[PDB]
mmCIF file of all heavy atoms in Angstrom:
data_model
loop_
_atom_site.group_PDB
_atom_site.id
_atom_site.type_symbol
_atom_site.label_atom_id
_atom_site.label_comp_id
_atom_site.label_asym_id
_atom_site.label_seq_id
_atom_site.Cartn_x
_atom_site.Cartn_y
_atom_site.Cartn_z
ATOM 1 N N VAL X 1 40.223 -51.014 -59.178
ATOM 2 C CA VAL X 1 41.236 -52.027 -58.890
ATOM 3 C C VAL X 1 42.485 -51.299 -58.402
ATOM 4 O O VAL X 1 43.312 -50.856 -59.199
ATOM 5 C CB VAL X 1 41.533 -52.902 -60.110
ATOM 6 C CG1 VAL X 1 42.411 -54.076 -59.715
ATOM 7 C CG2 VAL X 1 40.240 -53.389 -60.740
ATOM 8 N N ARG X 2 42.622 -51.175 -57.085
ATOM 9 C CA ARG X 2 43.789 -50.549 -56.484
ATOM 10 C C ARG X 2 43.982 -51.138 -55.096
ATOM 11 O O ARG X 2 43.058 -51.708 -54.511
ATOM 12 C CB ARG X 2 43.637 -49.026 -56.407
ATOM 13 C CG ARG X 2 42.942 -48.536 -55.143
ATOM 14 C CD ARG X 2 42.612 -47.059 -55.216
ATOM 15 N NE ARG X 2 41.539 -46.701 -54.296
ATOM 16 C CZ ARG X 2 41.405 -45.516 -53.714
ATOM 17 N NH1 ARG X 2 42.259 -44.532 -53.942
ATOM 18 N NH2 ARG X 2 40.386 -45.313 -52.885
ATOM 19 N N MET X 3 45.196 -51.000 -54.572
ATOM 20 C CA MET X 3 45.463 -51.453 -53.216
ATOM 21 C C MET X 3 44.730 -50.549 -52.235
ATOM 22 O O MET X 3 44.784 -49.321 -52.346
ATOM 23 C CB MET X 3 46.965 -51.451 -52.936
ATOM 24 C CG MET X 3 47.333 -51.967 -51.554
ATOM 25 S SD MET X 3 49.109 -51.987 -51.246
ATOM 26 C CE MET X 3 49.453 -50.240 -51.084
ATOM 27 N N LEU X 4 44.038 -51.158 -51.272
ATOM 28 C CA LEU X 4 43.169 -50.417 -50.358
ATOM 29 C C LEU X 4 43.954 -50.050 -49.104
ATOM 30 O O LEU X 4 43.865 -50.699 -48.061
ATOM 31 C CB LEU X 4 41.930 -51.236 -50.021
ATOM 32 C CG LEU X 4 41.051 -51.651 -51.200
ATOM 33 C CD1 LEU X 4 39.980 -52.621 -50.742
ATOM 34 C CD2 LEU X 4 40.422 -50.437 -51.859
ATOM 35 N N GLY X 5 44.739 -48.980 -49.213
ATOM 36 C CA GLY X 5 45.411 -48.395 -48.075
ATOM 37 C C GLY X 5 46.878 -48.172 -48.341
ATOM 38 O O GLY X 5 47.366 -48.309 -49.468
ATOM 39 N N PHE X 6 47.596 -47.814 -47.280
ATOM 40 C CA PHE X 6 49.027 -47.542 -47.337
ATOM 41 C C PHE X 6 49.530 -47.463 -45.902
ATOM 42 O O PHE X 6 48.744 -47.410 -44.954
ATOM 43 C CB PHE X 6 49.326 -46.251 -48.100
ATOM 44 C CG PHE X 6 50.652 -46.254 -48.800
ATOM 45 C CD1 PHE X 6 50.768 -46.767 -50.078
ATOM 46 C CD2 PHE X 6 51.779 -45.746 -48.185
ATOM 47 C CE1 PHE X 6 51.981 -46.773 -50.727
ATOM 48 C CE2 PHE X 6 52.997 -45.752 -48.828
ATOM 49 C CZ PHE X 6 53.098 -46.264 -50.103
ATOM 50 N N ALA X 7 50.852 -47.460 -45.754
ATOM 51 C CA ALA X 7 51.489 -47.391 -44.448
ATOM 52 C C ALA X 7 52.565 -46.316 -44.454
ATOM 53 O O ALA X 7 53.144 -45.998 -45.495
ATOM 54 C CB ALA X 7 52.105 -48.738 -44.057
ATOM 55 N N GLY X 8 52.828 -45.758 -43.275
ATOM 56 C CA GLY X 8 53.837 -44.729 -43.136
ATOM 57 C C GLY X 8 54.222 -44.556 -41.682
ATOM 58 O O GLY X 8 53.688 -45.220 -40.792
ATOM 59 N N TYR X 9 55.162 -43.644 -41.454
ATOM 60 C CA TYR X 9 55.688 -43.358 -40.127
ATOM 61 C C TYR X 9 55.335 -41.933 -39.728
ATOM 62 O O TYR X 9 55.512 -40.998 -40.513
ATOM 63 C CB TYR X 9 57.207 -43.547 -40.088
ATOM 64 C CG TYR X 9 57.647 -44.957 -40.392
ATOM 65 C CD1 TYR X 9 58.026 -45.327 -41.673
ATOM 66 C CD2 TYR X 9 57.680 -45.922 -39.399
ATOM 67 C CE1 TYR X 9 58.425 -46.614 -41.955
ATOM 68 C CE2 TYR X 9 58.078 -47.209 -39.670
ATOM 69 C CZ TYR X 9 58.449 -47.551 -40.949
ATOM 70 O OH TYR X 9 58.847 -48.838 -41.222
ATOM 71 N N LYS X 10 54.839 -41.773 -38.505
ATOM 72 C CA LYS X 10 54.452 -40.454 -38.022
ATOM 73 C C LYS X 10 55.661 -39.532 -37.998
ATOM 74 O O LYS X 10 56.709 -39.881 -37.448
ATOM 75 C CB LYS X 10 53.849 -40.558 -36.624
ATOM 76 C CG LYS X 10 53.115 -39.310 -36.171
ATOM 77 C CD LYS X 10 52.177 -39.609 -35.016
ATOM 78 C CE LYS X 10 51.869 -38.361 -34.212
ATOM 79 N NZ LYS X 10 50.715 -38.559 -33.297
ATOM 80 N N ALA X 11 55.513 -38.347 -38.586
ATOM 81 C CA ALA X 11 56.572 -37.348 -38.597
ATOM 82 C C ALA X 11 56.314 -36.223 -37.611
ATOM 83 O O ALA X 11 57.168 -35.934 -36.769
ATOM 84 C CB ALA X 11 56.749 -36.772 -40.008
ATOM 85 N N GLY X 12 55.154 -35.578 -37.681
ATOM 86 C CA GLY X 12 54.866 -34.518 -36.731
ATOM 87 C C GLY X 12 53.573 -33.805 -37.069
ATOM 88 O O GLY X 12 52.743 -34.325 -37.809
ATOM 89 N N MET X 13 53.422 -32.608 -36.509
ATOM 90 C CA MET X 13 52.240 -31.787 -36.720
ATOM 91 C C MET X 13 52.646 -30.359 -37.049
ATOM 92 O O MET X 13 53.660 -29.853 -36.561
ATOM 93 C CB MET X 13 51.328 -31.775 -35.488
ATOM 94 C CG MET X 13 50.534 -33.047 -35.285
ATOM 95 S SD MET X 13 49.238 -32.859 -34.050
ATOM 96 C CE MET X 13 48.023 -31.925 -34.973
ATOM 97 N N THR X 14 51.839 -29.718 -37.890
ATOM 98 C CA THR X 14 51.969 -28.301 -38.200
ATOM 99 C C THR X 14 50.564 -27.751 -38.410
ATOM 100 O O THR X 14 49.568 -28.405 -38.089
ATOM 101 C CB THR X 14 52.862 -28.079 -39.428
ATOM 102 O OG1 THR X 14 52.319 -28.780 -40.551
ATOM 103 C CG2 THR X 14 54.268 -28.578 -39.165
ATOM 104 N N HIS X 15 50.472 -26.545 -38.960
ATOM 105 C CA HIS X 15 49.181 -25.959 -39.283
ATOM 106 C C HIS X 15 49.275 -25.232 -40.615
ATOM 107 O O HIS X 15 50.350 -24.809 -41.042
ATOM 108 C CB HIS X 15 48.698 -25.007 -38.180
ATOM 109 C CG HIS X 15 49.445 -23.711 -38.118
ATOM 110 N ND1 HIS X 15 50.377 -23.439 -37.141
ATOM 111 C CD2 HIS X 15 49.382 -22.605 -38.896
ATOM 112 C CE1 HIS X 15 50.864 -22.225 -37.328
ATOM 113 N NE2 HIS X 15 50.277 -21.698 -38.386
ATOM 114 N N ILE X 16 48.123 -25.102 -41.272
ATOM 115 C CA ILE X 16 48.020 -24.416 -42.549
ATOM 116 C C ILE X 16 46.810 -23.493 -42.515
ATOM 117 O O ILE X 16 45.929 -23.611 -41.661
ATOM 118 C CB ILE X 16 47.907 -25.398 -43.736
ATOM 119 C CG1 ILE X 16 46.686 -26.307 -43.583
ATOM 120 C CG2 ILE X 16 49.159 -26.244 -43.842
ATOM 121 C CD1 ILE X 16 46.154 -26.828 -44.894
ATOM 122 N N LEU X 17 46.788 -22.556 -43.456
ATOM 123 C CA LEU X 17 45.627 -21.718 -43.719
ATOM 124 C C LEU X 17 45.171 -21.983 -45.145
ATOM 125 O O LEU X 17 45.980 -21.929 -46.076
ATOM 126 C CB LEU X 17 45.954 -20.236 -43.533
ATOM 127 C CG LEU X 17 45.801 -19.686 -42.116
ATOM 128 C CD1 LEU X 17 46.976 -20.102 -41.256
ATOM 129 C CD2 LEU X 17 45.669 -18.179 -42.152
ATOM 130 N N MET X 18 43.884 -22.276 -45.314
ATOM 131 C CA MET X 18 43.352 -22.640 -46.618
ATOM 132 C C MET X 18 41.946 -22.085 -46.775
ATOM 133 O O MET X 18 41.295 -21.695 -45.804
ATOM 134 C CB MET X 18 43.331 -24.162 -46.812
ATOM 135 C CG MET X 18 42.402 -24.907 -45.855
ATOM 136 S SD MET X 18 41.796 -26.468 -46.525
ATOM 137 C CE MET X 18 40.998 -27.186 -45.087
ATOM 138 N N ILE X 19 41.485 -22.061 -48.021
ATOM 139 C CA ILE X 19 40.117 -21.667 -48.336
ATOM 140 C C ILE X 19 39.240 -22.908 -48.207
ATOM 141 O O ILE X 19 39.392 -23.869 -48.965
ATOM 142 C CB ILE X 19 40.015 -21.057 -49.738
ATOM 143 C CG1 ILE X 19 41.042 -19.934 -49.908
ATOM 144 C CG2 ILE X 19 38.615 -20.540 -49.992
ATOM 145 C CD1 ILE X 19 40.910 -18.810 -48.902
ATOM 146 N N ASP X 20 38.323 -22.889 -47.246
ATOM 147 C CA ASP X 20 37.486 -24.051 -46.987
ATOM 148 C C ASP X 20 36.582 -24.337 -48.179
ATOM 149 O O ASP X 20 36.101 -23.421 -48.850
ATOM 150 C CB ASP X 20 36.645 -23.821 -45.734
ATOM 151 C CG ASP X 20 35.882 -25.057 -45.311
ATOM 152 O OD1 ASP X 20 35.841 -26.023 -46.098
ATOM 153 O OD2 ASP X 20 35.322 -25.063 -44.195
ATOM 154 N N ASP X 21 36.353 -25.626 -48.442
ATOM 155 C CA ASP X 21 35.515 -26.055 -49.553
ATOM 156 C C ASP X 21 34.384 -26.992 -49.155
ATOM 157 O O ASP X 21 33.426 -27.125 -49.923
ATOM 158 C CB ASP X 21 36.366 -26.751 -50.627
ATOM 159 C CG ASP X 21 37.187 -27.890 -50.069
ATOM 160 O OD1 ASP X 21 37.026 -28.206 -48.873
ATOM 161 O OD2 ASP X 21 37.992 -28.471 -50.826
ATOM 162 N N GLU X 22 34.461 -27.641 -47.997
ATOM 163 C CA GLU X 22 33.393 -28.530 -47.572
ATOM 164 C C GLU X 22 32.175 -27.727 -47.126
ATOM 165 O O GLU X 22 32.284 -26.542 -46.805
ATOM 166 C CB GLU X 22 33.867 -29.437 -46.440
ATOM 167 C CG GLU X 22 34.497 -28.723 -45.258
ATOM 168 C CD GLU X 22 35.105 -29.683 -44.257
ATOM 169 O OE1 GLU X 22 34.355 -30.219 -43.413
ATOM 170 O OE2 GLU X 22 36.333 -29.902 -44.311
ATOM 171 N N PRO X 23 30.996 -28.348 -47.103
ATOM 172 C CA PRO X 23 29.780 -27.598 -46.765
ATOM 173 C C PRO X 23 29.832 -27.039 -45.351
ATOM 174 O O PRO X 23 30.422 -27.631 -44.445
ATOM 175 C CB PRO X 23 28.662 -28.638 -46.915
ATOM 176 C CG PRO X 23 29.254 -29.755 -47.706
ATOM 177 C CD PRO X 23 30.709 -29.765 -47.381
ATOM 178 N N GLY X 24 29.207 -25.890 -45.174
ATOM 179 C CA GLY X 24 29.134 -25.256 -43.873
ATOM 180 C C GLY X 24 29.052 -23.751 -44.019
ATOM 181 O O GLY X 24 29.062 -23.206 -45.119
ATOM 182 N N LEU X 25 28.961 -23.084 -42.867
ATOM 183 C CA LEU X 25 28.993 -21.625 -42.859
ATOM 184 C C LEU X 25 30.329 -21.103 -43.369
ATOM 185 O O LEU X 25 30.373 -20.148 -44.153
ATOM 186 C CB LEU X 25 28.718 -21.098 -41.451
ATOM 187 C CG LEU X 25 27.272 -20.695 -41.161
ATOM 188 C CD1 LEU X 25 26.903 -19.434 -41.924
ATOM 189 C CD2 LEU X 25 26.328 -21.821 -41.519
ATOM 190 N N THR X 26 31.429 -21.717 -42.937
ATOM 191 C CA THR X 26 32.764 -21.309 -43.377
ATOM 192 C C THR X 26 33.106 -22.034 -44.678
ATOM 193 O O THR X 26 33.963 -22.915 -44.741
ATOM 194 C CB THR X 26 33.797 -21.586 -42.291
ATOM 195 O OG1 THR X 26 34.094 -22.986 -42.246
ATOM 196 C CG2 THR X 26 33.283 -21.139 -40.931
ATOM 197 N N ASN X 27 32.396 -21.648 -45.734
ATOM 198 C CA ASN X 27 32.637 -22.156 -47.078
ATOM 199 C C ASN X 27 33.117 -21.004 -47.946
ATOM 200 O O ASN X 27 32.416 -19.996 -48.086
ATOM 201 C CB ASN X 27 31.375 -22.788 -47.668
ATOM 202 C CG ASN X 27 31.665 -23.620 -48.899
ATOM 203 O OD1 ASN X 27 32.454 -23.227 -49.756
ATOM 204 N ND2 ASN X 27 31.028 -24.781 -48.991
ATOM 205 N N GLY X 28 34.301 -21.158 -48.531
ATOM 206 C CA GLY X 28 34.912 -20.085 -49.283
ATOM 207 C C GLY X 28 35.655 -19.071 -48.447
ATOM 208 O O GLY X 28 36.025 -18.014 -48.970
ATOM 209 N N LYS X 29 35.883 -19.354 -47.168
ATOM 210 C CA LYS X 29 36.562 -18.441 -46.263
ATOM 211 C C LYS X 29 37.881 -19.047 -45.808
ATOM 212 O O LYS X 29 38.037 -20.270 -45.756
ATOM 213 C CB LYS X 29 35.692 -18.124 -45.044
ATOM 214 C CG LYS X 29 34.454 -17.314 -45.371
ATOM 215 C CD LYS X 29 33.646 -17.004 -44.127
ATOM 216 C CE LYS X 29 32.396 -16.212 -44.470
ATOM 217 N NZ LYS X 29 31.577 -15.905 -43.267
ATOM 218 N N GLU X 30 38.834 -18.179 -45.483
ATOM 219 C CA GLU X 30 40.141 -18.617 -45.012
ATOM 220 C C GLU X 30 40.029 -19.055 -43.557
ATOM 221 O O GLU X 30 39.578 -18.284 -42.705
ATOM 222 C CB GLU X 30 41.158 -17.489 -45.159
ATOM 223 C CG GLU X 30 42.595 -17.953 -45.242
ATOM 224 C CD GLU X 30 43.550 -16.815 -45.526
ATOM 225 O OE1 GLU X 30 43.219 -15.662 -45.182
ATOM 226 O OE2 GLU X 30 44.630 -17.071 -46.095
ATOM 227 N N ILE X 31 40.441 -20.290 -43.272
ATOM 228 C CA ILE X 31 40.313 -20.860 -41.939
ATOM 229 C C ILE X 31 41.626 -21.514 -41.538
ATOM 230 O O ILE X 31 42.472 -21.840 -42.372
ATOM 231 C CB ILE X 31 39.163 -21.884 -41.849
ATOM 232 C CG1 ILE X 31 39.422 -23.079 -42.771
ATOM 233 C CG2 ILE X 31 37.846 -21.223 -42.203
ATOM 234 C CD1 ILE X 31 38.466 -24.222 -42.560
#
């Protein structure tokens, strides 16, 4: 029981480096 969604205003784009966790070859690697 929760509200299904939300609204907001576009701010911009950037990039990050993280340890991947979803399935694939690049699992546990910095991407």
Side-chain angles (χ1 to χ4, degrees):
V1 189
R2 88 189 158 150
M3 182 179 72
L4 301 172
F6 210 87
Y9 298 95
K10 194 161 157 166
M13 285 192 76
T14 58
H15 72 255
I16 59 154
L17 273 77
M18 64 153 171
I19 308 302
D20 187 349
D21 54 5
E22 52 187 278
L25 264 290
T26 76
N27 194 318
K29 292 181 181 179
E30 203 174 26
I31 63 170

